[PDB]
Design a protein around this ligand. Sequence first.
Ligand code: HEM
Ligand SMILES: O=C(O)c1ccc(CO)cc1
Ligand SMILES: [Cl-]
Length: 393
Amino acid sequence: TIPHLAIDPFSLDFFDDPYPDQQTLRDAGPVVYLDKWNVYGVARYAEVHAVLNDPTTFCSSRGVGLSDFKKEKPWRPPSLILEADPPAHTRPRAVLSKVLSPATMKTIRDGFAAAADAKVDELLQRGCIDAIADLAEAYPLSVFPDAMGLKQEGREHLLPYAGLVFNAFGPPNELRQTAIERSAPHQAYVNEQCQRPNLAPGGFGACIHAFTDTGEITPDEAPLLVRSLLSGALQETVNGIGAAVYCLARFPGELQRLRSDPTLARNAFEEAVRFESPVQTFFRTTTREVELGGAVIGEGEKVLMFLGSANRDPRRWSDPDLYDITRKTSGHVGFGSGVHMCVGQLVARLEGEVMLSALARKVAAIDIDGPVKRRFNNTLRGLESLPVKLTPA
Ligand code: HEM
Ligand SMILES: O=C(O)c1ccc(CO)cc1
Ligand SMILES: [Cl-]
Protein backbone atom coordinates (compact mmCIF):
# COMPACT_ATOMS: atom_id res chain seq x y z
CA THR A 1 0.00 0.00 0.00
CA ILE A 2 2.89 2.34 0.84
CA PRO A 3 5.11 3.25 -2.14
CA HIS A 4 8.76 2.31 -1.64
CA LEU A 5 11.20 4.86 -3.05
CA ALA A 6 14.98 4.69 -3.47
CA ILE A 7 15.48 8.47 -3.25
CA ASP A 8 18.21 9.40 -0.78
CA PRO A 9 17.13 12.83 0.55
CA PHE A 10 20.56 13.10 2.19
CA SER A 11 22.70 12.71 -0.94
CA LEU A 12 24.68 15.47 -2.61
CA ASP A 13 22.61 14.97 -5.77
CA PHE A 14 19.46 15.63 -3.73
CA PHE A 15 20.86 18.69 -1.94
CA ASP A 16 22.00 20.12 -5.28
CA ASP A 17 18.42 20.17 -6.63
CA PRO A 18 15.83 18.75 -4.21
CA TYR A 19 12.67 20.12 -5.83
CA PRO A 20 12.14 17.56 -8.63
CA ASP A 21 12.63 14.72 -6.14
CA GLN A 22 10.40 16.49 -3.60
CA GLN A 23 7.52 16.45 -6.09
CA THR A 24 8.15 12.74 -6.65
CA LEU A 25 7.90 12.25 -2.88
CA ARG A 26 4.67 14.25 -2.67
CA ASP A 27 2.99 12.69 -5.71
CA ALA A 28 3.96 9.11 -4.80
CA GLY A 29 1.49 9.29 -1.92
CA PRO A 30 0.73 10.86 1.46
CA VAL A 31 3.10 8.39 3.17
CA VAL A 32 6.16 6.89 1.48
CA TYR A 33 8.83 4.47 2.67
CA LEU A 34 12.49 5.30 2.02
CA ASP A 35 14.30 2.01 1.39
CA LYS A 36 17.71 3.72 1.60
CA TRP A 37 17.36 4.46 5.32
CA ASN A 38 14.33 2.35 6.37
CA VAL A 39 12.17 5.29 7.45
CA TYR A 40 8.71 6.56 6.60
CA GLY A 41 8.47 9.85 4.75
CA VAL A 42 5.84 12.56 4.46
CA ALA A 43 6.32 15.42 2.00
CA ARG A 44 2.86 16.97 1.61
CA TYR A 45 1.79 19.91 3.76
CA ALA A 46 -1.23 18.09 5.21
CA GLU A 47 0.67 15.09 6.57
CA VAL A 48 3.71 17.11 7.69
CA HIS A 49 1.42 19.50 9.58
CA ALA A 50 -0.40 16.51 11.08
CA VAL A 51 2.80 14.87 12.36
CA LEU A 52 4.06 18.16 13.80
CA ASN A 53 0.81 18.69 15.73
CA ASP A 54 0.64 15.16 17.20
CA PRO A 55 3.58 15.04 19.64
CA THR A 56 1.95 12.24 21.65
CA THR A 57 2.10 9.82 18.71
CA PHE A 58 5.08 11.31 16.83
CA CYS A 59 7.44 12.03 19.71
CA SER A 60 10.77 13.86 19.74
CA SER A 61 12.39 12.38 22.87
CA ARG A 62 13.67 9.41 20.84
CA GLY A 63 15.59 11.85 18.64
CA VAL A 64 14.62 14.28 15.87
CA GLY A 65 17.37 12.83 13.68
CA LEU A 66 17.65 9.44 12.04
CA SER A 67 19.17 7.90 15.17
CA ASP A 68 16.72 6.31 17.61
CA PHE A 69 17.87 7.23 21.12
CA LYS A 70 16.15 4.09 22.44
CA LYS A 71 18.54 2.09 20.21
CA GLU A 72 21.71 4.19 19.83
CA LYS A 73 23.70 6.48 22.08
CA PRO A 74 23.17 10.16 21.20
CA TRP A 75 26.39 11.82 20.05
CA ARG A 76 25.74 14.51 22.69
CA PRO A 77 23.47 14.83 25.74
CA PRO A 78 19.90 15.18 24.44
CA SER A 79 18.42 18.65 24.14
CA LEU A 80 16.13 19.46 27.05
CA ILE A 81 13.60 21.11 24.73
CA LEU A 82 14.11 19.99 21.13
CA GLU A 83 14.53 16.30 22.00
CA ALA A 84 11.92 16.20 24.77
CA ASP A 85 8.19 15.57 24.93
CA PRO A 86 5.50 17.02 27.19
CA PRO A 87 5.37 17.26 30.11
CA ALA A 88 9.18 17.28 30.40
CA HIS A 89 9.36 19.70 27.45
CA THR A 90 6.78 22.13 28.84
CA ARG A 91 8.64 24.10 31.51
CA PRO A 92 12.00 24.40 29.68
CA ARG A 93 9.95 25.62 26.72
CA ALA A 94 8.31 28.26 28.93
CA VAL A 95 11.71 29.52 30.12
CA LEU A 96 13.05 29.94 26.59
CA SER A 97 9.72 31.52 25.66
CA LYS A 98 10.18 34.14 28.39
CA VAL A 99 13.86 34.71 27.61
CA LEU A 100 13.11 35.17 23.89
CA SER A 101 9.88 36.99 24.72
CA PRO A 102 8.17 39.91 23.00
CA ALA A 103 9.31 42.13 25.88
CA THR A 104 12.90 41.03 25.19
CA MET A 105 12.62 41.91 21.49
CA LYS A 106 11.84 45.51 22.49
CA THR A 107 15.14 45.74 24.39
CA ILE A 108 17.29 44.61 21.43
CA ARG A 109 15.43 45.86 18.34
CA ASP A 110 17.10 49.29 18.21
CA GLY A 111 20.58 47.81 18.54
CA PHE A 112 19.79 45.10 16.00
CA ALA A 113 18.33 47.56 13.48
CA ALA A 114 21.21 50.03 13.87
CA ALA A 115 23.75 47.24 13.33
CA ALA A 116 21.81 46.09 10.27
CA ASP A 117 21.92 49.59 8.77
CA ALA A 118 25.61 49.99 9.63
CA LYS A 119 26.44 46.70 7.89
CA VAL A 120 24.58 47.58 4.68
CA ASP A 121 26.29 50.98 4.58
CA GLU A 122 29.66 49.28 5.03
CA LEU A 123 28.85 46.83 2.23
CA LEU A 124 27.80 49.64 -0.12
CA GLN A 125 31.30 51.10 0.28
CA ARG A 126 32.75 47.87 -1.15
CA GLY A 127 30.18 47.41 -3.92
CA CYS A 128 31.10 43.82 -4.81
CA ILE A 129 30.63 41.62 -1.73
CA ASP A 130 29.87 38.05 -0.71
CA ALA A 131 26.25 38.23 0.47
CA ILE A 132 26.89 35.11 2.59
CA ALA A 133 30.15 35.83 4.39
CA ASP A 134 29.87 39.63 4.40
CA LEU A 135 26.10 39.88 5.01
CA ALA A 136 24.23 36.65 5.76
CA GLU A 137 26.97 35.51 8.16
CA ALA A 138 28.57 38.78 9.24
CA TYR A 139 25.43 40.52 10.49
CA PRO A 140 23.99 37.79 12.79
CA LEU A 141 27.52 37.15 14.09
CA SER A 142 27.67 40.85 15.03
CA VAL A 143 24.41 40.96 17.03
CA PHE A 144 23.47 37.48 18.23
CA PRO A 145 26.64 36.43 20.12
CA ASP A 146 26.57 39.81 21.85
CA ALA A 147 22.86 39.40 22.62
CA MET A 148 23.68 35.94 24.00
CA GLY A 149 26.30 37.49 26.27
CA LEU A 150 29.19 35.48 24.82
CA LYS A 151 32.81 36.54 25.14
CA GLN A 152 34.73 37.62 22.05
CA GLU A 153 37.14 34.68 22.21
CA GLY A 154 36.22 31.49 20.38
CA ARG A 155 33.26 32.83 18.39
CA GLU A 156 34.74 31.11 15.32
CA HIS A 157 33.39 27.84 16.79
CA LEU A 158 29.74 28.93 16.70
CA LEU A 159 28.98 28.27 13.02
CA PRO A 160 31.09 25.06 12.86
CA TYR A 161 29.20 23.73 15.88
CA ALA A 162 25.85 24.68 14.34
CA GLY A 163 26.63 22.82 11.12
CA LEU A 164 27.83 19.85 13.16
CA VAL A 165 24.53 19.67 15.05
CA PHE A 166 22.39 19.68 11.91
CA ASN A 167 24.73 17.28 10.12
CA ALA A 168 24.35 14.92 13.09
CA PHE A 169 20.56 14.89 12.59
CA GLY A 170 21.20 13.08 9.32
CA PRO A 171 21.96 9.45 8.54
CA PRO A 172 25.42 7.99 9.14
CA ASN A 173 26.66 9.20 5.74
CA GLU A 174 30.04 10.85 5.21
CA LEU A 175 28.62 14.31 5.99
CA ARG A 176 27.59 13.25 9.50
CA GLN A 177 30.65 11.18 10.40
CA THR A 178 33.10 13.76 9.09
CA ALA A 179 31.38 16.46 11.16
CA ILE A 180 31.43 14.36 14.33
CA GLU A 181 35.08 13.55 13.62
CA ARG A 182 36.02 17.25 13.69
CA SER A 183 33.66 18.01 16.57
CA ALA A 184 35.90 17.93 19.66
CA PRO A 185 37.08 21.59 19.72
CA HIS A 186 33.63 22.97 18.85
CA GLN A 187 31.94 20.90 21.57
CA ALA A 188 34.47 22.01 24.18
CA TYR A 189 33.94 25.69 23.38
CA VAL A 190 30.14 25.56 23.32
CA ASN A 191 29.83 23.50 26.51
CA GLU A 192 32.16 25.88 28.35
CA GLN A 193 30.27 29.03 27.34
CA CYS A 194 27.06 27.46 28.69
CA GLN A 195 28.37 27.88 32.25
CA ARG A 196 26.92 30.85 34.13
CA PRO A 197 30.27 32.62 34.89
CA ASN A 198 31.06 32.82 31.16
CA LEU A 199 27.81 34.61 30.20
CA ALA A 200 27.64 38.40 30.29
CA PRO A 201 24.87 39.92 32.44
CA GLY A 202 21.72 41.02 30.65
CA GLY A 203 22.21 38.57 27.79
CA PHE A 204 20.09 35.58 26.86
CA GLY A 205 22.49 33.15 28.52
CA ALA A 206 22.58 34.92 31.87
CA CYS A 207 18.80 35.33 31.69
CA ILE A 208 18.41 31.56 31.27
CA HIS A 209 20.49 30.96 34.40
CA ALA A 210 18.41 33.58 36.22
CA PHE A 211 15.27 31.51 35.54
CA THR A 212 16.56 28.60 37.65
CA ASP A 213 14.77 29.65 40.85
CA THR A 214 11.20 29.70 39.50
CA GLY A 215 10.71 25.93 39.62
CA GLU A 216 10.63 25.65 35.82
CA ILE A 217 14.29 24.65 35.37
CA THR A 218 17.04 23.70 37.81
CA PRO A 219 20.58 25.15 37.85
CA ASP A 220 21.96 21.89 36.43
CA GLU A 221 19.49 22.18 33.53
CA ALA A 222 20.52 25.75 32.66
CA PRO A 223 23.72 25.00 30.65
CA LEU A 224 21.81 22.66 28.32
CA LEU A 225 19.19 25.33 27.61
CA VAL A 226 21.99 27.77 26.75
CA ARG A 227 23.42 25.07 24.47
CA SER A 228 20.11 25.06 22.57
CA LEU A 229 20.64 28.71 21.63
CA LEU A 230 24.21 27.86 20.58
CA SER A 231 23.10 24.89 18.46
CA GLY A 232 20.14 26.01 16.38
CA ALA A 233 19.90 29.79 16.04
CA LEU A 234 22.77 31.19 13.98
CA GLN A 235 23.19 29.03 10.88
CA GLU A 236 19.50 28.76 9.97
CA THR A 237 19.05 32.51 10.47
CA VAL A 238 22.14 33.03 8.31
CA ASN A 239 20.69 30.65 5.72
CA GLY A 240 17.36 32.48 5.90
CA ILE A 241 18.90 35.92 5.45
CA GLY A 242 21.16 34.55 2.72
CA ALA A 243 18.10 33.10 1.00
CA ALA A 244 16.29 36.46 1.10
CA VAL A 245 19.22 38.25 -0.55
CA TYR A 246 19.34 35.40 -3.07
CA CYS A 247 15.62 35.76 -3.81
CA LEU A 248 15.83 39.56 -4.04
CA ALA A 249 18.64 39.12 -6.59
CA ARG A 250 16.81 36.46 -8.63
CA PHE A 251 13.40 38.18 -8.42
CA PRO A 252 14.25 41.85 -9.11
CA GLY A 253 10.56 42.73 -9.23
CA GLU A 254 10.22 41.75 -5.58
CA LEU A 255 13.19 43.92 -4.63
CA GLN A 256 11.52 46.84 -6.40
CA ARG A 257 8.29 46.21 -4.48
CA LEU A 258 10.25 45.98 -1.22
CA ARG A 259 11.99 49.28 -1.98
CA SER A 260 8.64 50.99 -2.60
CA ASP A 261 7.27 49.66 0.72
CA PRO A 262 10.00 48.85 3.26
CA THR A 263 7.33 47.72 5.74
CA LEU A 264 7.12 44.53 3.64
CA ALA A 265 10.54 43.58 5.06
CA ARG A 266 9.17 41.29 7.78
CA ASN A 267 7.00 39.38 5.31
CA ALA A 268 9.80 39.39 2.73
CA PHE A 269 11.88 37.46 5.26
CA GLU A 270 8.99 35.17 6.22
CA GLU A 271 8.47 34.31 2.55
CA ALA A 272 12.21 33.66 2.23
CA VAL A 273 11.88 31.21 5.12
CA ARG A 274 9.03 29.47 3.31
CA PHE A 275 10.74 29.62 -0.10
CA GLU A 276 14.08 28.21 1.08
CA SER A 277 13.18 26.48 4.37
CA PRO A 278 16.65 26.66 5.98
CA VAL A 279 15.64 23.65 8.08
CA GLN A 280 14.69 21.16 5.37
CA THR A 281 13.85 18.02 7.35
CA PHE A 282 13.23 16.73 10.86
CA PHE A 283 12.43 13.28 12.22
CA ARG A 284 9.78 12.00 14.61
CA THR A 285 9.40 8.56 16.19
CA THR A 286 6.07 6.77 16.51
CA THR A 287 5.16 5.84 20.08
CA ARG A 288 2.39 3.50 18.89
CA GLU A 289 0.77 2.03 15.81
CA VAL A 290 -0.83 4.95 13.96
CA GLU A 291 -2.86 5.46 10.79
CA LEU A 292 -1.77 8.45 8.70
CA GLY A 293 -2.81 9.09 5.11
CA GLY A 294 -4.25 5.59 4.82
CA ALA A 295 -0.98 3.97 5.93
CA VAL A 296 -0.49 1.97 9.13
CA ILE A 297 2.85 2.91 10.72
CA GLY A 298 4.07 0.59 13.46
CA GLU A 299 5.47 1.56 16.83
CA GLY A 300 9.04 2.79 17.10
CA GLU A 301 9.31 3.88 13.46
CA LYS A 302 11.22 6.96 12.32
CA VAL A 303 9.10 9.39 10.28
CA LEU A 304 10.95 11.92 8.13
CA MET A 305 9.14 15.24 7.62
CA PHE A 306 10.05 17.27 4.53
CA LEU A 307 9.45 20.80 5.80
CA GLY A 308 10.81 22.40 2.64
CA SER A 309 8.57 20.22 0.49
CA ALA A 310 5.54 21.00 2.67
CA ASN A 311 6.28 24.69 2.05
CA ARG A 312 6.21 24.10 -1.73
CA ASP A 313 3.23 21.73 -1.88
CA PRO A 314 0.85 22.99 -4.62
CA ARG A 315 -1.99 21.36 -2.65
CA ARG A 316 -1.47 24.17 -0.11
CA TRP A 317 0.43 27.01 -1.84
CA SER A 318 -0.46 28.85 -5.04
CA ASP A 319 2.59 29.17 -7.29
CA PRO A 320 4.86 27.65 -4.61
CA ASP A 321 7.97 28.10 -6.79
CA LEU A 322 7.55 31.90 -6.82
CA TYR A 323 9.05 34.24 -4.23
CA ASP A 324 6.18 36.60 -3.33
CA ILE A 325 6.80 39.13 -0.56
CA THR A 326 3.05 39.83 -0.27
CA ARG A 327 2.08 36.15 -0.02
CA LYS A 328 0.00 35.15 2.99
CA THR A 329 2.72 32.99 4.56
CA SER A 330 0.66 32.12 7.65
CA GLY A 331 0.75 28.36 8.20
CA HIS A 332 4.15 27.53 6.70
CA VAL A 333 6.29 25.01 8.58
CA GLY A 334 9.66 26.69 8.11
CA PHE A 335 9.67 27.26 11.88
CA GLY A 336 7.84 24.01 12.60
CA SER A 337 4.33 23.79 13.99
CA GLY A 338 2.83 22.90 17.35
CA VAL A 339 4.45 22.49 20.76
CA HIS A 340 7.97 22.53 19.27
CA MET A 341 7.46 25.48 16.89
CA CYS A 342 10.68 27.52 16.90
CA VAL A 343 10.83 29.27 20.28
CA GLY A 344 13.44 31.66 18.86
CA GLN A 345 11.37 32.69 15.85
CA LEU A 346 11.04 36.24 17.20
CA VAL A 347 14.83 36.67 17.22
CA ALA A 348 15.18 35.27 13.69
CA ARG A 349 12.33 37.39 12.31
CA LEU A 350 13.77 40.49 14.00
CA GLU A 351 17.24 39.86 12.56
CA GLY A 352 15.73 39.16 9.14
CA GLU A 353 13.31 42.09 9.15
CA VAL A 354 15.78 44.83 10.08
CA MET A 355 18.33 43.55 7.56
CA LEU A 356 15.78 43.47 4.73
CA SER A 357 14.57 46.89 5.91
CA ALA A 358 18.13 48.22 5.67
CA LEU A 359 18.46 46.76 2.17
CA ALA A 360 15.04 48.11 1.16
CA ARG A 361 16.04 51.66 2.14
CA LYS A 362 19.68 51.77 1.00
CA VAL A 363 20.03 49.38 -1.97
CA ALA A 364 18.71 49.98 -5.49
CA ALA A 365 19.69 46.64 -7.05
CA ILE A 366 21.36 43.33 -6.20
CA ASP A 367 23.10 41.62 -9.12
CA ILE A 368 24.87 38.26 -8.97
CA ASP A 369 28.36 38.79 -10.39
CA GLY A 370 30.10 35.54 -9.48
CA PRO A 371 29.83 31.75 -9.14
CA VAL A 372 27.12 30.81 -6.65
CA LYS A 373 28.23 28.00 -4.33
CA ARG A 374 25.94 25.81 -2.21
CA ARG A 375 26.86 24.49 1.24
CA PHE A 376 25.79 20.89 1.77
CA ASN A 377 24.28 19.82 5.09
CA ASN A 378 22.21 16.81 6.12
CA THR A 379 19.49 19.10 7.51
CA LEU A 380 20.20 22.69 6.42
CA ARG A 381 19.76 24.27 3.00
CA GLY A 382 21.86 27.36 2.37
CA LEU A 383 24.51 28.93 0.20
CA GLU A 384 28.26 28.79 0.72
CA SER A 385 28.95 31.92 -1.34
CA LEU A 386 26.72 34.54 -3.00
CA PRO A 387 28.84 37.04 -4.95
CA VAL A 388 26.65 40.10 -5.49
CA LYS A 389 27.06 43.68 -6.61
CA LEU A 390 25.16 46.21 -4.49
CA THR A 391 23.96 49.37 -6.23
CA PRO A 392 23.27 52.22 -3.76
CA ALA A 393 19.74 53.58 -3.86
C1 HEM B 1 15.38 31.30 9.94
C2 HEM B 1 15.60 31.01 11.23
C3 HEM B 1 15.15 29.70 11.93
C4 HEM B 1 14.58 28.59 11.42
C5 HEM B 1 14.21 28.28 9.95
C6 HEM B 1 14.35 27.66 12.51
C7 HEM B 1 13.78 26.41 12.42
C8 HEM B 1 13.27 25.68 13.47
C9 HEM B 1 12.34 24.58 13.39
C10 HEM B 1 11.74 24.00 12.09
C11 HEM B 1 12.09 24.14 14.63
C12 HEM B 1 11.14 22.97 14.99
C13 HEM B 1 11.95 21.76 15.44
C14 HEM B 1 11.04 20.57 15.62
O1 HEM B 1 9.81 20.73 15.39
O2 HEM B 1 11.53 19.47 15.98
C15 HEM B 1 12.86 24.95 15.55
C16 HEM B 1 12.89 24.84 16.92
C17 HEM B 1 13.72 25.57 17.76
N1 HEM B 1 14.43 26.71 17.43
FE1 HEM B 1 14.56 27.50 15.56
N2 HEM B 1 14.80 28.25 13.68
C18 HEM B 1 15.29 29.50 13.36
C19 HEM B 1 15.83 30.40 14.26
C20 HEM B 1 16.03 30.18 15.61
C21 HEM B 1 16.55 31.14 16.57
C22 HEM B 1 16.98 32.58 16.18
C23 HEM B 1 16.59 30.54 17.77
C24 HEM B 1 17.05 31.09 19.15
C25 HEM B 1 17.43 32.36 19.38
C26 HEM B 1 16.08 29.19 17.61
C27 HEM B 1 15.95 28.24 18.60
C28 HEM B 1 15.13 27.13 18.54
C29 HEM B 1 14.85 26.20 19.62
C30 HEM B 1 15.41 26.27 21.05
C31 HEM B 1 14.01 25.27 19.15
C32 HEM B 1 13.42 24.09 19.94
C33 HEM B 1 12.01 24.53 20.35
C34 HEM B 1 11.22 23.38 20.89
O3 HEM B 1 11.70 22.22 20.81
O4 HEM B 1 10.10 23.63 21.42
N3 HEM B 1 15.75 29.01 16.28
N4 HEM B 1 13.57 25.88 14.81
O1 LIG C 1 17.84 22.33 21.49
C1 LIG C 1 18.67 22.42 20.54
O2 LIG C 1 19.90 22.27 20.76
C2 LIG C 1 18.17 22.69 19.12
C3 LIG C 1 18.96 22.40 18.03
C4 LIG C 1 18.50 22.65 16.75
C5 LIG C 1 17.24 23.20 16.57
C6 LIG C 1 16.72 23.48 15.16
O3 LIG C 1 16.22 24.79 15.13
C7 LIG C 1 16.45 23.49 17.66
C8 LIG C 1 16.91 23.24 18.94
CL1 LIG D 1 27.96 19.30 22.64
